[PDB]
Design a protein around this ligand. Structure first.
Ligand code: HEM
Ligand SMILES: [Kr]
Ligand SMILES: [Kr]
Ligand SMILES: [Kr]
Ligand SMILES: [Kr]
Ligand SMILES: [Kr]
Ligand SMILES: [Kr]
Ligand SMILES: [Kr]
Ligand SMILES: [Kr]
Ligand SMILES: [Kr]
Ligand SMILES: [Kr]
Ligand SMILES: [Kr]
Ligand SMILES: [Kr]
Ligand SMILES: [Kr]
Ligand SMILES: [Kr]
Length: 148
């Protein structure tokens, strides 16, 4: 496809500073849905405020984990079927930690936000539509983790 090249080219500039960019994604996320904050229980403790998460090594490690999973999607953009199995698993895990399926829509908007802000004039509506499709496919696979 040509959309596959839109994803690859758009990902390049972001992927080289994954923590800085994933920090924008999570900051947006908590701004849209603050009820996600408590889902991150390290040492059984809850973050009071969004800025509390950004001082947590474990939370920042999770940022990196996310950016890695996106990087895998980008890699396999032409053939997403290879990640299905892993993603179904990742969904069940998130079911178990307490994430509701509906929160993945917020996540996706947060991803689109972060790309928009990074790319500026380069984040064309085709680029947006390309990412929305890819994220779509990711969440489809992950939502098999809520039984079916
Ligand atoms: C509402 C959004 C999310 C919440 C509340 C959440 C929360 C968590 C928690 C609590 C863990 C276990 C603790 C940890 O390893 O840090 C976890 C693990 C993980 N999450 Fe998320 N997460 C979310 C979204 C995502 C997204 C969108 C991805 C990937 C694109 C992702 C990838 C991961 C990975 C890769 C792990 C490690 C799983 C394992 O191997 O056990 N998470 N997440
Ligand atoms: Kr992220
Ligand atoms: Kr954050
Ligand atoms: Kr924040
Ligand atoms: Kr990454
Ligand atoms: Kr991955
Ligand atoms: Kr992985
Ligand atoms: Kr993702
Ligand atoms: Kr998983
Ligand atoms: Kr999880
Ligand atoms: Kr996320
Ligand atoms: Kr994401
Ligand atoms: Kr997206
Ligand atoms: Kr994605
Ligand atoms: Kr996928």
């Amino acid at each position: 496809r040509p959309e596959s090249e839109l994803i690859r080219q758009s990902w390049r500039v972001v992927s080289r500073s994954p923590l800085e960019h994933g920090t924008v994604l999570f900051a947006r996320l908590f701004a849209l849905e603050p009820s996600l904050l408590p889902l991150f229980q390290y040492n059984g403790r809850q973050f009071s405020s969004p800025e509390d998460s950004l001082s947590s090594p474990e939370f920042l490690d999770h940022i990196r984990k996310v950016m890695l999973v996106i990087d895998a999607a980008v890699t396999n953009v032409e053939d997403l079927s290879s990640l299905e199995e892993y993603l179904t698993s990742l969904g069940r895990k998130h079911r178990a930690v307490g994430v509701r399926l509906s929160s993945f829509s917020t996540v996706g908007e947060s991803l689109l936000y972060m790309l928009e802000k990074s790319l500026g004039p380069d984040f064309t509506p085709a680029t947006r539509t390309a990412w929305s499709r890819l994220y779509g496919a990711v969440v489809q696979a992950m939502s098999r983790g809520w039984d079916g």
